[PDB]
Structure formats: C-alpha cells, structure tokens
Amino acid sequence: ERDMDELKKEVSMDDHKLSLDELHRKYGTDLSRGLTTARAAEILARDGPNALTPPPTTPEWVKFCRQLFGGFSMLLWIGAVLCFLAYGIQAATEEEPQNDNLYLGVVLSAVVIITGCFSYYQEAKSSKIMESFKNMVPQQALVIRNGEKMSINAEEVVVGDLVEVKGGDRIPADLRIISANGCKVDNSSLTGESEPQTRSPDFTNENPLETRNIAFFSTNCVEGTARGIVVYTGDRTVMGRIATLASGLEGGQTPIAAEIEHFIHIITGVAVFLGVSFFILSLILEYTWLEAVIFLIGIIVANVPEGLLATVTVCLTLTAKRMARKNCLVKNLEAVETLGSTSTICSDKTGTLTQNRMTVAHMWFDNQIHEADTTENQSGVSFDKTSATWLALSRIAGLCNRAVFQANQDNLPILKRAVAGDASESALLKCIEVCCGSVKEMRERYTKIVEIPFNSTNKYQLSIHKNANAGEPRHLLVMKGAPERILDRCSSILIHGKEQPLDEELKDAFQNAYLELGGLGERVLGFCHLLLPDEQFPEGFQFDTDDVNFPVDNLCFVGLISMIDPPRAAVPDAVGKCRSAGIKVIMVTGDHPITAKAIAKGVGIISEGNETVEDIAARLNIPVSQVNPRDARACVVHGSDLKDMTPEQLDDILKYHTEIVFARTSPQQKLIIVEGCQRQGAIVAVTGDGVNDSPALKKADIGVAMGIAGSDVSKQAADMILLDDNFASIVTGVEEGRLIFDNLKKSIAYTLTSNIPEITPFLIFIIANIPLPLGTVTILCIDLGTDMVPAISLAYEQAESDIMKRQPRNPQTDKLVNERLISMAYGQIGMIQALGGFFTYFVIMAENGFLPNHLLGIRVTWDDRWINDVEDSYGQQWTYEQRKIVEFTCHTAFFVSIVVVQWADLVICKTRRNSVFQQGMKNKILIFGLFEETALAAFLSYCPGMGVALRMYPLKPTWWFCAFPYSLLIFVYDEVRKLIIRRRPGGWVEKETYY
C-alpha cells in the first residue's frame, strides 16, 4: 500500500491528446451513437458503479477504546495496575488496603473510564452533527447509447460511452470532450480556477488539468452544451484519487498532546527518582524487602495526579464548547489549541479568502474609469449614472446576455440571489438590475431577432434588436467581446452621447486603461454597439446568421466593463489580525497569477509598498533576471517553476520572502508547500474550500475547512470546520488557543501543588516513625474531592495582557510544563502547604495529650491493634480505637488545612505575572470555587456518620485557624514574587520562577 500512496502523491497523466479517430479506436466506441446498451451493462458489472468507494473510515463504537488510552490515560492505567499489584503483594498478610489501595486502583480506573466516556461523547456528538449536514442529492447523467439519449442514474455510467452535458448540469465522470457549443464548465473546486474555463474538442495545454478537451467529475457546467466520451469512472477519476489520497494520509501528533507527553515524562521521572531513592533509604534503616517494595509503590503511585486528567479534559471541553458557540466546530478535542501555536497560515484563495462570486468592479466612460459598489450589502459608493454613455453601455450589457433570473428569486437581495447564466453574464445581470433598474421590461423592450452566441474562436457575442425610442426607428446592434478583437473590429467612439472617430491618443488611452484594469487583476470585457442604416436594412428585412447583414467593422465602441470576485467581509481584518499576531500568511492557490496577486494585495497578504521581483524589473525598465531577489520582500511563485524546484530552493523562497503567494499550484504542490513549511520546524494551519485542499488540510498541523462553500472531501480531511464561513473565526481561534494554553499551566500547577502536602505525610511517616498525619481517603477527597471546582474555574481566567501582540510560542523553547513550573509548585508553595498541614497535625495531637517530640517512634506501638495501653506525654493510657480516632481526627484537619492553603494557592495561581490587585477577582466561577470548596470540606468533617463511613470526624473550632498564617504567607510570598517579576524583567526571579 506504500507503493499505492507513493503513486497517489504523483500528479496525473492521460490520453487526452488524441485524434477522435484514435480515441474511439482505443475505447472501442461510436462517437455519435455512443455504445450499445449491452456493452454499457457489461462494463457496469465488470469493475464497479460510478461513484467513490465510501470513505474507508467507519469506526465501530469499539472506537470507544481510542479515548480510553491516549498518552495520559495510560499513565493513570499503569498507576492503577501498580495499585492492584501493591494490593496483591499486600495479600501476603492480613491487610487494611481493602479500604485503601484497592480503592485507589479502582478509583484510578473509574477516572480513566469516565474521562474517556465524556471525551468520546463530545467527539461523537460532533460526529452526529456532522452526519446531519450530509445532503447528497442524486443527479442523473444524460448518456447516449445506440443512437438514443437516455438519462440514467449517475452510478450506472461506464467508461467510453457518449455523455451530453448542459447548463447547470453536473459532470457525471471524467470525460474527453468530442464536441462543444458555448460550454463553460466551473472548475473552481477541483483545480482552483476562479473563472469558468471554456471547454473545446481541441487539445490546448499538455497538462490534462488546464487543457480544454477534458471535463472533470464533481464540476458543475456553467453554460452551453457539450458531448464527450468517458475516460474515467468512480474511484479511478481525478478527485477520486485526490480523495483516496486524502483518506490515506496521517493526522500527525498535536502539539498539545506532545506537551502532555513531555509533562508525563517529567512527573514519572520525579516519581521514580523519589521512589528509588526512598526505596534505597528505607532499606538502609530496618524494614524488610516486603515493606520496602510497599513503600516504593506507595510513593511512585502517590506522585500520580489522579484528578488532573479530569480537570484537563474538562478544560479542553469547555474551550471547545465556546468554539461551538461561535459555530467553529472542531472534529478533534485536542485540535482546539493548535491555532494559538501556529506560526504560518497557508490559505487558498477562491472559496476561502474570497466570496467566489464574480462581480462588476470598474467601468469605462468617456475615457474615465468609475468604480461600482463591490460590497455584498451595497455599503459602498455609487458612481454617476446621469451620463447618457452609462445608459447606452448599461443597455448593451443588459440586452446581450444568456443570463436570466430564475423563477423563485423575488424577495432575495439582487446580489446573493441565484442566476442561470455565465459568471460574467451573472455579474453583469445583477449590476444592471441594481443600478439601472429592472432588466425584465428593459430586455423585453427590445425584441431580439438573430443572435450569435460567443464563438469558439474570437469569442465575440452579438445580438440585434428593434428600436424602442420615439425619434429614430433604426435597427440596434450590440456586441460584447475581448477588448483587443473588438478594438480590431471597431472604429467610431461614443462620448457623452455623441460619437467620434478613433484617434490614436484616446485609442492608446483606452489601451493603457485596459492594461491598467487587466493588471489590476480584473477580467475586462469590451462593449460596443452600432445602430443600423434602416434605409439599406428596412423594417421588414429578415436577416440571419448565415452571412454578414450588418457592418461588422466601423462599429461604435462604448466602454469597458471589468469584473472580479471580492474577498469575504471579515477576511481583510482577519488577515491583518493574523499578521499582528506574528503569524506568517502565505496564499497558496492554483488560480492564475494576475488574479492571485491582486487578491493577495486586496486582503493584505501582500502589503502596500512591498514589491515582487517583477515589479522592480517593471519600474526600472530592466530585464527581470537582472535585479537582486534579496531586494524583493514579496514574491509570487508561478506553478510552472515549482515542479522543477528542489527542497533547498523552496526553503530559500520561504525563508527570504516575508509575503509569499504561490500561484497555479496543483494540490500535490500545496502538500509540498505545507511540508516545506513544516521542514522549517514551524506549526502550520491551512484553510481551503475545494478538494484541491484535501491533501494539504489533511497533512497540516491543523486543517480548517468551510461549512457551506467547501467540498466534501476537504471537509472530511480537515481537523476543523467553519459552519458560518466566517474567516474571522480563525483569529478567534489563534486567540482562543493562545489563552487556553496559559490557563492550562495554572490549572496543572494548582493540582501539582497539592501533591507535596499529599505525599510528605506518608514520607516522614516512614522516616520519623510518627503516626500517619494524612490518610488515603482524605487525599482522594482533595485531588478528586475539592480541588476540582477551583481547578476548573481556573480555566475561566482571561488574558493577563494582549495575547495577540506577542510572537507565537516556540515549541522547542516554550513548554507547557517546564523546570520553572516544577521549581515553583513542588519546590516552594507546596512545601509551605506541607508545613501548614504538619503544624495543624501537631496542634491537634499536642492538644489531646501527645507532644510532638514524644511522637517519634510511636507508630510501631501506635499502629499495633493489640496494645491498649499507650502512654502519652501526660502518662495516660490509650486503647487502640481511641488513639486511632484521634489520628482520624488528625486526618480531617489535615485535609481541611490542605483546602485552606489551596485558597491562597488558587488565588495566586489565578495570575502567572500580574498582581491579584490588578487582574481582579472578577472571575465568578473562581469565587464559587472557594465557597463550594470550603462548604464541602466543612460538610465532610461535620456530616453525621462520616466518622463511621470515611472515618472523617468533626473538627474543634480552633483547628480551622491553624493553617491560616501559612496560607497568608503563601499569598504574600507569591504576591511580592509577582511584584519583583514585574519590576525587574531581567530577571533572576523571572528566569528561575516565572512559568
């Protein structure tokens, strides 16, 4: 299969260039009569129906398992297995862990299971809402067999049978065009070409993709009619190969998951360091290998942050919820953050950056160019329509067209409403409908007699009607066509309602105007009219298209009409915000260079003032090869050159040019550009619409498709989708992703601060041989019991500064959890928390008759069930359950004290840099975190029967206030730390602490 996907990454080839003789000699077909019914029915069952094999991915609900493993749920899994193993070793004697260690493993297991359940439910919900969006309407092909046209199901079409396509019809399979009349197909999705390309029987370009003798699958035919023999069917077609390639690539590891892996390696690192060093230490004193192993497992497992999976998953889920609120839907749960880490965005032009709707831009009147309103809501400026030249031109443009408003468009806005016709004809129709009034009564005002549709050669389209005016009953003739040819066929010029001959001054003014608008990226169509000598051509004269009835030369040229597809409204602002974020924007398109660069300048991918090599060569009147490419900050790379390029050349291009636009690029080349960007070691986001973006959007670190105007294949290959087709969301994304990162740290930090006061009680327990300060149940009531709500609330923290001002993070340098962070949580704050806990501990025990210095070495006799006389400092005798009750009352106050220091830890974790007096307590979820936390702890302590159940006993009032000064110390310490960090950003406190 490797060889297969090696053959799918290579651009295609074909038989497209042949004589029709050799075409049907090879295919064994009749040109006019197609094939026989029996032959078609033979080929249909020979290989397979015409359709793509349904997407190879249909994971059974057993895919649940996918969410139960990952990289972190694995750590919790081995944690649980170590727990169960430890219990197994503890079956060596009669043992308590029935209430301790087995419960610990089962709890870990429950956490993994539930987390997987939730994440899987979210992803599955996204899957469902994606399934609902699938609307597939069967479109039956019109075939021709045994001389008769039969319209049959598209999936019944075979190889090498004659097929006819008409206006609006979708191309059934890959065809070789034998004949054509006025046929413009829409290739916008497949090859990326914006304007409809004419299709002809003739061989034009060597590359089968840009040639005119081939029609492609999934392309809609704009206008005209055509006949062709089917070259390819089903999965063997072009987009079928694109789809099978896109389905056969790999997602790649997300930066977030990688950071999680690094983090895990750290935590397990200190886990086994402590475990081993303490195993050795414990063997150094007394305890046998049994007890020693028990201690090893106890520590390594204790170092595992049980609730951190839950909290992180919930966090990602929350941000994902907001993304969904903005109608930005991410297929994958961990692909939400990726945007924030993206240093380069490769975007396609048509369908993505643009509205993909051809619209009239500038016009030519009286040797003057006037810009129309190109906005969708018509919020711009209208030209001056008082001029009669505009009246004449508008009448010409409106009267000769194939464009017709379809039946059901009435209430809809004249722009966004549907039109049956060509691109140019649609734009013209809409413009004339808005500006000059209704084109209905105006088109039927003049009665069309005999018209010539745009020819295969010279492409001139003319029509001629009677006169609707009062004074002059002359026969009116109108023609539109390419500026140069109509320049060849015209003599007279119209200005301000009165004619003239052509003088080379204003003729070349017209020329330079045409080259200006053409160089501006817009496509220009020349418009002319000639009234006729009704004396020579009477009112009864019936003239046909056989010969020339009308003086094809010496016409009256009126003006030019240029058109282009505008960018979507939120696009320029979005690109600006992206460039402000430090993200490099590179347009990647298979469109023509002239339009590509223009659009790029329009949206701001290429800024004002920057010049390409060709621009410098143009201004200085020197050969293009002369100027130094280093002097060119912006570049447009023709697709022709990219095929001959090596990796070093692409690297140099990407390095030495800030504003880059790749034009006339095939899908595979898009893939190569993306991979080239990844060779630089930089995170990549790609945005596209059609199937040509399917290989790119798949391979990219994160893909982004368009909900409506995007195709199905690239929608499947994308890791993210925009439902409302709002480009601005991308900015929000890189905003969101950049924020959620910071909060995550905080979140993580918080829980990891809890482990030090969690672990140490069982540590010194082994060391100083003191009664156990902190039980297992309490610890579970901390990690999963209390800290949950604050840790989640830490996700509702906002930006501490402008996040879109800073440069994108460095994956190698900037880490999620790094040495600084551990230096903080484990090193400093957690230690103070532990001190607070042991303080409370000693307070309780000392107040009940057991002094701290006496408490050393007691546990041996203390944990003994059968010693019921145990002397405190006062000389009193304690039974087992009595002193164990005291110890259990020490557990609860230790737990509460943990909550108490977690107050201060929560507040200070709320902000990594800013002082709390700045960022404010404005987060409400945080406040409720505190209240709920305290109330929960107090409940656990004081709820009836909890001394029987969890063996948590009520606390005397004073107990509660023992942990206060340590918490205050934590707050003050981190506050002055977050002071000095602000004041001295050299900085020692900044390098060592700030995380």
Added chain:
Amino acid sequence: SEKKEFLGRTGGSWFKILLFYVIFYGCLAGIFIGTIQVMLLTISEFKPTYQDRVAPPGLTQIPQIQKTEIAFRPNDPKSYMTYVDNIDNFLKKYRDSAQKDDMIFEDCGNVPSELKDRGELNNEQGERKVCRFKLEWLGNCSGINDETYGYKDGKPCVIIKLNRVLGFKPKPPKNESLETYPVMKYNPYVLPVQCTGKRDEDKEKVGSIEYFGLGGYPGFPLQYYPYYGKLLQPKYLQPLLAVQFTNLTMDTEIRIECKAYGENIGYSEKDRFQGRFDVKI
C-alpha cells in the same frame, strides 16, 4: 549531561539557586518552629487540654498477647517463658523493696477506702505522695516467693488493670444495682469487675473463677484515685486485680470477657478493650 559550560542540566548559576533554596527552606523551617513554639506555649504543664477522648477507660492484661490469646504448654518451660517474663517485668515495679521511701510513698488502707484528694491541679503543693500496693494483695498469683510460681502453670491466671486517666474519679454502681451477678457488699468504695465465657449469648462456658483483690475484694479501691499525672505523681502505682481460672477444659480454646461496672464506666462495641476486656485461652 556536561558541556561548556554547564553541569546537567544547566550548571552555571547553581550556586545562586541552591543558596536561594538554603535561605528559603531555612526561613520556612524557622517559621514552622515558631508556630510550633507558640503552640507549645499554649499547652499546660499539669493537665491536658482535651480529656474527652479517653473518657471510657479500658481494661488491660499483664501478658499482652499478639492477639488476645494465651496458648501454651503446661509442661514445656519455653512455652510460657514469654508470658512469665512479661509478668515479671510488669510487677517488677511493685516490689516491697521497690518502694522504700516514706517520702514519695504513702502506706494506705489494708482495706478499700474513700478517694484521696490532694490539693489542686497546680504546683502550689509539692510533688504528691503515692499509695503503696503490696503484691500480697494478689494471693496464689505471684505472691512474694511461695508459689505459684509458674504463673498459671497448673491453672491459668491473669491480672487485669484499669487504664490511667488524669483526674478520673471512678464511680462504682449504686447499691440498687441491677443484676450484677455474684458480687460482694462493699460496693460504695470500690469499682467492681466480673468475667464470663461469652457475653449476651449461648456459651461454651467451662470455668471456675477465683478473684484476688485488695483485701480479697474483686475490684479497684477508690483510695488510689484520682491519678494526678506523670509530673505531679511519678513512680505512680495503679491498682491491680488478679483473676485465676482453676477448672478449664485443657485442649479446647474458649474465650473470656471481663467487664468493669460503674457510672464512670462505659463500653464501646467497636473498641473491645474500652470499658471491657477479651482474652482467648
């Protein structure tokens, strides 16, 4: 690991970091010791702050077992050496030669008598005297030289002892007492104890019970109470009560529960040694 110039991982500034942690952890330590010091300033030298936890005092045995079971061969010396040595080290403090001093010791009634109240909890009066306890008070079990001496060797014997609680003044059951089983009539001045095979249910019971108390009285004299603490009354000798089982079934294991009765006494079903007692033999 190492390159120029760093020690794994980054070793240039190590002095700064480690100094910072020395000072830091030093401050943390000092702070903790401070809080603990004030905490220790708030604790009394005479009476503990909370006595509510030990409130139902427990009953304990002289040969504390692995788990509540005396199982030994009446023949093999090495069988009961454990128990025997335990009782030896237990009653080593009670010898007539062990208490010589009339200074720190007081010769009290040969018969159970009223509670002895000495001053207050404070140090106003000096170190308090302690009543004497003669080993003769327990006959046939460890009385001086003559007999046993095998310490239950012919037939099982165990002394029961009440736990010590500061200021505790044991209240014996009223003379109106409800079904306390055969007991003597001296009830006002002593805290009583009685033993049975199984408590409230059908019994395997085989036994013959002989009690040695103060003056041959099955219970603790109140004249040894209240206990004034380790500080005010060091070398304090608490009352002891010997219980011998003469007739028993030898090769079969039976269980025995001893209960102490009184108003100041209470029992926990969860704590089997609290207020009551359990031994398998």
Added chain:
Amino acid sequence: DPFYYDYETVRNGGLIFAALAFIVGLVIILSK
C-alpha cells in the same frame, strides 16, 4: 466533667455554615 465535649453544637455550626456558604456561592454564580 472535662470528659464531656459538645460535638453536636459544633457539628450544627459546621453544617449550617456549609449550607450558608454553598447557597451564597450559588448566588455568586448567578449574576442575573
């Protein structure tokens, strides 16, 4: 007797607080 501590009043106080702070936090979450 010093051997009697009132755990029930302390308990009541704890639970009552719990209810108060919990419902207060509920008031905080809902900002109208």
